[PDB]
Amino acid sequence: SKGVITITDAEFESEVLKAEQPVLVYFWASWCGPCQLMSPLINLAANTYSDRLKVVKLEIDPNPTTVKKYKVEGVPALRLVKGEQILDSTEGVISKDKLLSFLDTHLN
């Protein structure tokens, strides 16, 4: 988990639901401007919590099943999960500081 892995609906169960660590799931789309600001930040979080968190990302268009499962009705969006448990969630661009606290609160 040094970085971010891009997954699809087909890989969701093995890469996320059955992962051993909590997973930060980032939803984005190519037509999403603000998503461009978040992508770099998500990559930073992955490197920063490399030993305690797995970070994955899904494009919404080709992945209808996961999008529906998490009620993703807007991008960018984040879901912090552990198996079937959703620990927290957020919508929209957030600052590096807000992201780090979002994570610290749950990882500790």
From Swiss-Prot:
The keyword Electron transport applies. One of its GO terms (biological process) is cell redox homeostasis. SUPFAM superfamilies: Thioredoxin-like. Gene3D superfamilies: Glutaredoxin. GO terms for molecular function: protein-disulfide reductase activity. CDD domains: TRX_family. Residues 1-108 form the Thioredoxin domain. Keywords: Disulfide bond, Electron transport, Redox-active center, Transport. It holds the Pfam family Thioredoxin. GO terms for cellular component: cytosol. Disulfide bonds join 32-35. It comes from the Bacteria. Belongs to the thioredoxin family. Participates in various redox reactions through the reversible oxidation of its active center dithiol to a disulfide and catalyzes dithiol-disulfide exchange reactions. This is Thioredoxin 2. It comes from Nostoc sp. (strain PCC 7120 / SAG 25.82 / UTEX 2576). The lineage of its organism: Bacteria, Bacillati, Cyanobacteriota, Cyanophyceae, Nostocales.
